[PDB]
Amino acid sequence: GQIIKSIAAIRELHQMCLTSMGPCGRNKIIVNHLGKIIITNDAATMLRELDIVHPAVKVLVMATEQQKIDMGDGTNLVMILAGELLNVSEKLISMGLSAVEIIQGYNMARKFTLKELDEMVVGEITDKNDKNELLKMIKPVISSKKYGSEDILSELVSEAVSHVLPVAQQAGEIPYFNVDSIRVVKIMGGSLSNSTVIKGMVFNREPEGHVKSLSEDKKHKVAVFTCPLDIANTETKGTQIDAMMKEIADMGVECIVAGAGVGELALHYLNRYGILVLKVPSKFELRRLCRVCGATPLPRLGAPTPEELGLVETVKTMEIGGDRVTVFKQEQGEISRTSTIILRGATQNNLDDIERAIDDGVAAVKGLMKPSGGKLLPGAGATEIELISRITKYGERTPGLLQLAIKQFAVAFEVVPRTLAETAGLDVNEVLPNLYAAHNVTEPGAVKTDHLYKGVDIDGESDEGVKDIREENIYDMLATKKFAINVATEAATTVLSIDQIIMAKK
Amino acid sequence: RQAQISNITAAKAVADVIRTCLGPKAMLKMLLDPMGGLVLTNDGHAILREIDVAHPAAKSMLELSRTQDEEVGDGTTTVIILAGEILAQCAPYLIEKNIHPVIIIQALKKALTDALEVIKQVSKPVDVENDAAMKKLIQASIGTKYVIHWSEKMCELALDAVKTVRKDLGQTVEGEPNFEIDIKRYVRVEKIPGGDVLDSRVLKGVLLNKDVVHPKMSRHIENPRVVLLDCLMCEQILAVRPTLVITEKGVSDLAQHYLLKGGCSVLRRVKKSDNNRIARVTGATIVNRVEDLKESDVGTNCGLFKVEMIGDEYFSFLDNCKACTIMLRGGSKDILNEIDRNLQDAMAVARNVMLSPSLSPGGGATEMAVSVKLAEKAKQLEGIQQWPYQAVADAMECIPRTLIQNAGGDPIRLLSQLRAKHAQGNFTTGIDGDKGKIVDMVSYGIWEPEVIKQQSVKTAIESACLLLRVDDIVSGV
Amino acid sequence: KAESLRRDAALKVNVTSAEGLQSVLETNLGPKGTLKMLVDGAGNIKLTKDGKVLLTEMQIQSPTAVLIARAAAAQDEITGDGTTTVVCLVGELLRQAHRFIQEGVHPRIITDGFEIARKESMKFLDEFKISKTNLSNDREFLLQVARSSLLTKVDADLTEVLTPIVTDAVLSVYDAQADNLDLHMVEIMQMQHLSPKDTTFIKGLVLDHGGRHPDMPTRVKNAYVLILNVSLEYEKTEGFFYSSADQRDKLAASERKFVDAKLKKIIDLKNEVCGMDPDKGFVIINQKGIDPMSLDVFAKHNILALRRAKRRNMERLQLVTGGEAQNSVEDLSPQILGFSGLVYQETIGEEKFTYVTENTDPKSCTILIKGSTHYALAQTKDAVRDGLRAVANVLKDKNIIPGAGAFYIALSRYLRSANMNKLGAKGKTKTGIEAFAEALLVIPKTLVKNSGFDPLDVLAMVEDELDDAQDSDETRYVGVDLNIGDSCDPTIEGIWDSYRVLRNAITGATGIASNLLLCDELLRAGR
């Protein structure tokens, strides 16, 4: 049985993710073959580092790539749903239900699940781009990464997000928020309260010039050059240095950036006269300077055409955690298209891992864009437990052997409320049966009131049963759920269809 | 938990052996002895007889089959299959869900109570005082025996047997014993060599194969006075007004003529143990020597005395008006023994219906009906017991599954059709053996004594607790 | 402490075993058959084509084959022949089934068709039989029956020898007035020092111990036989003192004179019954011994004298001539003697044997198996023990079946064409209708294979003639011609078969195959 051997393989990565997902989750130590210690809860980082052996794993891993590239969340939702969807299929296999009949069932359930998810909508983010509306989503996204640190990270992100979401109104066809709109840097030392946000670009390299600040005027004009700065060389061969700034400043420039090297006298004179000098090793970061300072790089040398100058409010050199950085930023004007997250933290693993979490929080806001992304679902398995009950109803409505598959299909959605419990340390022999009753009630009405809000208690508030998601404002993104169901349903269908693994001609 | 797992793996194997031993189309099992013997029997008792087991849990599966067979003459493989899957379906609940055995045991007890409710609901009443229907019932219920051509009397012989043994008491003072029957002891069947199966008859009393000493003798005395003696003496006998003289030892001509002169019959070779059986049905006093005969030698409670010869042996009828003796007739003692193999089996069939006047929907309709009724109860039951409660429902589907598998049909699709037939339709929908089709038990009767299903479930859950309650296997002498 | 196959490969094990019993016990079928060698390890060789010998005296390695063999052993104890056809039918029923098993047909469905065919096979058997009259002029048919059973078990040159022997033997035992026959009244004797073609039919009974004295008459034309139980050797009443050679015998002869007075009384019978009269004679066969001098006196009166008789043959000897066993010569009467014809004692240098023939009214006969070697005497002994039961099956059951496989051939045609058109089973069970009819060809097929003739072509030539009968509106009994290679008519050629054998052959083969096809797990007990 190839399908039996495949089940054995997925049991390995199922064990990996089963204990991973959740704010109470457990970290994994990952040793890079190049000599790096990686400790994270991100299963995408895990699978990137995990060598793949059994070809059936290649299906599940590439599935998580579809989720992670196309959606900034859902990594464990794919691995967790997929793991159990194939685990419960072992019962269907052993009951004698053929592979094609199991496949037909999961596809029939794909339609049932998607239609119900549309009915599970509780609220909707009205796209006010307000810090309060952002926090409603940013908090639960930061959750599952660092439990209890949401206060520090929420104030960091929601304020940083307001830097890259400018004042926009009547805008549903104008896209905003590129993933590169928020940069995160690492400064060894300090703690969470030592982190901050800069409204613009921060160079991790120490100040290279001798000038600390520009003038006090608003919208200090700035130049970027592409050609190497030296004594004017003729258009051909040749087998003035400082005169560049005499040309640049004509329009109002206090800051001169050189995308290339610097000539003899200018290295002294550009800084001597109080002008900031910059050369950037990252050429995409030069494209960032086009977005932060608004600077249009001059393709020629020593000829700052007026159209090749930008307007940047303030550029200064700043001290972060004792290690010096150079800041090219905007200030209440020519609003910066990039904001920088200043992470001060002493442990290089927690420091880097905090960045890994904030990177995902940035990605979540990309999904908070206009593509039908405001829809909210009830979190803490209220979506999952309610889906269980509604799926079993479709079983009663469905004649044939498809009834057997639908029944085992609902069982699979218990892995998410189970994982929330096993990681949190509440007895799965008590929390799970209390979840069933909390969501399974006889409502005097067609609208379940306060019974779609029943949650899973991951807090230390000792209580028999579970809590209400509105207490902490725990909502899940509908688009994350809907896309995840599509990925996992098709991914499990793929594994369930593998009848033989044949080596190609070699 | 590892020790409890090993107990589970034991019963799964016991069941896999017995699994396909159920049905008129049952597959045969090959018993290989180390001496080279090979037996293809379909008797699940014989299968369990030779199965050499390792885990003592399997030894309790054997003791379970002994318990069922001793009480209810049927239920052998029904209990082994049912009990094993009851344990097996609980396996992921033990290992994966981390459910403590005490929780699982408590859940099975609640399922037992609820299951007995369903068994009552699906029952069909039958009137045990309708002897004509009891003949049609027992004759069909003993189906597939060697005496089909003689089933008329091979059935009626058992009906007239249980007719009298019925332990009849009913009142609110002591209670209703419900016609408790002991076929082993209370019934003393006297198999008569000679005759044919259909010539077999039923008597009332005790019948002895001890022959008569003189061919001319008082043949019938309606109110005799029986002298039970082992050993002047012939005259001493008559002092107490006797009519029948029974001697333990051999008897000479003098005892024939002297007692005949006074109108007394002579019977020889009757041991004091048969003289005690005479006392059970008449009441004569057992005496050794004739000089010790006293006035207590009486022949009370003697309805009929008969001396007829059958099978080269004269018989002494101790007839009187929880005991009976059947005058079974057979061309040989092996034919008489063949009667037992088929007749006493009918006695169990009648014992079951006399135990409770109720029938069970066969063809597996009982089990699939339980699997549906438990499902409706499960979703209405709160607590962790929602998980183990469903285990019994999945276990009750194995019995109808084996009826399909041994019928050669699709074991998956036919079960799902049965589920829908019991869900929206009647509880009487079962499995046909020959056609392999889903049929209603109204058309294809196969109505089974309910007490078989009641004791099968009771003993299955009982043994399931015995297998789950064991936490380790420890060596000790 | 358990071993079994949760996969159905137990069927692959059982089928593999049957294929072995096929390849072993198939090649012995037919007058074109081969001979199997059983070596007992003590140096004795049993050269046999007989199935019962190959079934009961083979070392069986396969545990499944133990069942097929022991079950087939029940064939001989019911009908007395047909054990090879059981083995072949079983193997092909299992082999044709394996084909349908791999198609997903549950063993039940296959088995039910095997039972449905059994019901149909009984119809054919009763319609195909030829009712035989009880005319004692059936010598032609009885001779033909003997050839059917002999040509199988012997080399076809001993058939011309054994054909009149077995035929005339059973003609003697078969009682008239519709009375039965008793094969226990037909004696089979073992004699060495002659060739296998010398096997002979004796009208009466032959005794082992012959005369041991030079004056014993060679033969008596008209013999009157005495069975004498009196001790004629040295006996004494239940003091002997001699002082010289002269006084020894005077005392012992006087004590033996108690015998000699009976020796006088025996020759007083001889004088009472034709002492000197011509064409009359006196044969003495004594349970006890005869004194050497008592033999001399028996020679004096020309008496054929035998001594130290075996009890069981002596009990027969009373039945042989109809005389009585004499417990005392003083009771010796003239009418006690039994009359017989040619009585002679043939001299074999090992032991002279007494031939007591042309007897009063014994209704009993003896077949003397002649042959020098042990492997030859055994083969012939089986041929006689088998053929006597073959001719018994015909005289007991007046129904004879056209042989040469006409039963197994025509039953194929009737079950192939009619059953589905009868609607006598079911649509899915048709796999059993085909399986059985295809397996019915194992008998006519094996008969051809062992002859060297083309297996397929001979079966085709049979079907062609059977088709002619359909348009000819006549009964044409078509069989396999194992000599020319073509078809033949069993009723013209003389090849016959038994109603009872074929009845129990199909019944048993269905049972053996049904039990094996329904096998699920092979279990180990006591381990």
Author numbering:
A (entry chain Q): 26 to 264, 283 to 549
B (entry chain g): 18 to 248, 282 to 371, 435 to 590
C (entry chain z): 9 to 246, 250 to 538
What did the original publication write about this model?
The TRiC/CCT complex assists in the folding of approximately 10% of cytosolic proteins through an ATP-driven conformational cycle, playing a crucial role in maintaining protein homeostasis. It consists of two identical stacked rings, each containing eight paralogous subunits (sharing ~25–40% sequence identity in the same organism) arranged in a specific order. An individual TRiC subunit comprises three domains: an equatorial domain (E domain) that contains the ATP-binding site and forms intra- and inter-ring contacts, an apical domain (A domain) that comprises the interaction sites with target proteins, and an intermediate domain (I domain) that connects the other two domains.
Moreover, the dominantly populated S5 state (63.3%) exhibits a conformation with both rings widely opened. Furthermore, its dominant population distribution indicates that this wide-open TRiC-ADP-S5 state likely represents the most stable state in the presence of ADP. We then compared the structures between the S3 and the better-resolved S5 states to capture the conformation transition in the final stage of ring opening. It appears that the A- and I-domains of CCT2 tilt up to 21 Å toward CCT5, accompanied by associated movement of CCT4. These collective movements of CCT2 and CCT4 greatly weaken the contacts with CCT1, particularly in the upper two domains, making it much more active. As a result, CCT1 exhibits a tremendous outward tilting of up to 44 Å, making TRiC appear wide open. Eventually, as the conformation transitions to the S5 state, the collective outward leaning of CCT5, CCT2, and CCT4 occurs, associated with the tilting of the CCT2 and CCT4 A-/I-domains towards CCT5. This leads to the resumption of E-domain interactions on the CCT2 side, ultimately closing the gap between the two rings on this side in the final fully open S5 state. Notably, CCT1 exhibits the most dramatic “ejection” movement in its A- and I-domains.
